[model samples]
Every structure is written in C-alpha cells, then in structure tokens.
Target: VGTLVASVLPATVFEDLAYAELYSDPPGLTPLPEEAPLIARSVAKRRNEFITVRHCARIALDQLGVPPAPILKGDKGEPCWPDGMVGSLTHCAGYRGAVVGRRDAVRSVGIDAEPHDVLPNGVLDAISLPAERADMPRTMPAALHWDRILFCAKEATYKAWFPLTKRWLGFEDAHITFETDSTGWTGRFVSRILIDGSTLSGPPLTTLRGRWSVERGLVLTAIVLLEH
Candidate 1:
C-alpha cells in the first residue's frame, strides 16, 4: 500500500541524483484549478503513476535543498527533464515514481517491475534461442513463467539501452544466459549498435551487463549504460 516497494542504490551512484515516491492518488494531480470528484478520479486512475512521481520528485527536491521543480509530460509523452538532466520512470500495481537528475547525465536508464504470473505457452519463444531455453532449470518442468521473466529482464535491459543507442535490438541482440543465485538472471548484450540512429560508439557498449530479480511475486529489472 506504500508508494515505493524498495529503493536501493550504491552510495556513490550519483552526487546529484535522487529517488523517492508517493501514493497513486496524491493530492497534487488535479489538472485544472477547479476540483471535480469524477474528473479527478478518472484523471487519477489514468496518471496515478505520474502524480506519485511528482510527489516523489518534490520530496527529493526538498531533501536536496533544490527548488521544487516537477517533471511534466510533453507532446511526445516523455518526461521533461530539468534543462541538463536525464533519467527514467516506472510503476507497478502497488507503487509508482521516478529517478532523475544530472546524475552524470544518464543516456539511457530503464526500470521495469512485473508481477509473477503464468504466461501463456510460447510467449517467450520469440525472445529466446533454443539453446537458452534448454538451459533453464531441468527440474520444475512447470516453472510457470520463468522463461518469460528472463526474457522480460532482457527487455528491461534493452529499454535502457535503446534510448541511449537509438538502435533497434532484436531479441537475438543479446542472450540472458546467467543466474544470480535464486533471485534473478543476467544477460550479455552480444550485438553491436547496428542502426543508423545510434548515438553511442566505443568499447564500452560491448560490455553491457544487467541485473534482475523476481521477488515477492514481482520481477524487477534494470539496465544502465554510459551516456555519450
């Protein structure tokens, strides 16, 4: 019922970055100055995550001694970052918010948390190779949706990567072929930035690594790549 499930970051993540949260129905989302219950609820349901995001940003601003500057949605529906900043947003059934700042000027950062559920058969087939599929735990033939969870982690990583690279990464661009104990899996981006719109170039792209986890019925995945 809280606005954020958990927030963990390395102590040295970024000097100017901040992250926080608020309830889905935070009072700051009344679009017009006038108040209407029906309109508010409708708006709240649609952008509940955004409102919580704003609330979190305000809190971060206060704590950091910065002015209360809120992120707004633009015509393209992207968060309007502070003049010289970058970051990402994500939400789940229970929590919603964002992470933002100059914070080294993130080129692409993705955050995705999904509920653990039984996926329909073969949904992960598109994202996985036959070899990767066979590598899954031999036990628990009915592991429900483990394959899709791994694939989703790959997606989460790609979401963080493509925004920076501006390249199209097919499912085969990488293989998520490792596990982090019993909580999650890891992927290796074995493909290069093979698209015209890519803005990044160098040795750093080849070593992209990611972390993922399935905890408390939720699958959380994130990807971080250097900005140009």
Candidate 2:
C-alpha cells in the first residue's frame, strides 16, 4: 500500500516526511493486538477504518525505530503516538492516510484527503466566514474549489492543534489565506489562529501552515510543524 500510495501522492513535498502512506481503498481489517481495546464492540465499518490506519501507523513507527504499540485515541479522540513521535491520521470516503516523524524532526503533522468536488450544497457557507469567501480568488483556475480547500486546511490545522494544546479548535477558530506560489499546481494556505490560549511554549502560534493538492480524485491537504 505504501508504494501504491507514494505513486499517487504529490512527491515534491510529501516525500520529505520521515514516513507516510496513503491508500485508495481501506485495507482489510487486519488486527493488531495493541489496538484491541480501542475498537472493542465497534461497528464493522468504523473498526475497519481504525485498524487499517493503525496498520499504517505501525509501519511508520517501525521506520522511526520505535516499537509497535497501539495508536489509540486520547481522551479528546485524537491519535496518540509513542513518546518522541508526532503524527496524524485522516480518512474520507475511499481514502485513508497516516504521516509520522520523530519529535525532533517535526513538532506535529496533519493530513486530510477529501473528494475533489464542491462541498455538499450550502456546506460552503456553513464552514467558512464571509470574509474568507469574499477573499476567494475571483479569477483563479476553475479546477480548484477554494472553499473546499479551505475546509481541508481547517481540518488539518485542528488535527495539528490538539496534540500541542489538548484543546478543542472549531472550524471558525482559524482564518485561512490561500496561495499558489509554492506548488504552482494545487497551491497552499496560511491559517491564523483566532482563539487565545497558551497554544505553544515559545511564541503563541499566530498562524499554522499547510499545503494542498488535487490528486487521485481527491483534494489532499497536509500541515507540518517544525522544531526550529
């Protein structure tokens, strides 16, 4: 699955990560002994998604020289990794992916994949603020749905946020500004965190960074926090 996933992913950026995997279809529900408690009594569909991504996570951990362990959800329902590791997992219809790295290499990681289509009718307004929509590139390429990309950016931002803060971040919490200079293909975005809190140890995180791509019939977005 890693090889197959690597082929479809945007190698130019994602290839630099310590470990990553993307699967077109969910893998068979291969059980890992440590993951038992997390999925006990879960419905079949939910169990499949959980185990398959955990399988990917195990592979990632192994690559990082960490022993395989249960990648369970924390009290807040985010994926919990072993000490000295930071990673994220995401799943949407027909897609599942995990990205992992040593704590020293990255502060955090988040990746999300969504179908490459307009968000469900009216969902655009539900997830975004008026200023965000008003700022959309009026003359941008037709192939890119800026609204959907913003949603994905927020999702990725929240995933990275919880590990650092252990606090809840809603869709409206981060304001996203999009760009195309980096990739010149699908583009990228910067997110400003509006909520006030001790979000990070050093400087408070005024912004979270992310990148997006349209690939294999899906819009994939990823964010990585570096330990600079």
Instruction: For candidate 1, write residues 1-228 as lDDT tens digits.
Output: 432223322233456556665434565554322223223545546655655665665665555456666456543345555665655666666556555555354555566666667556566777776666786554213443667566656666666665456556677666565454442232222223333434464334554544555555665565555445
Going through the candidates in order, what is the number of backbone clashes in each? 0, 0
Highest lDDT: give the candidate number: 2
lDDT of 2 at 89: 85
**Tens-digit lDDT track of model 2 for 1-228:** 344234223343443355546564454557777778888989988788777777778877787788877776776788778888888887877776778877775777877777777877488877887778878665245567777777888888888887788788887778888777534446667888889746556556668877777766777887887777
* Best of the candidates, TM-score: 2
Residue 130, candidate 1: C-alpha displacement in angstroms: 2.9
Instruction: Give the lowest summed-lDDT range of ten residues in model 2.
Output: 4-13
TM-score of 1: 0.67
lDDT for residue 207 in candidate 1, whole number 0-100 = 42
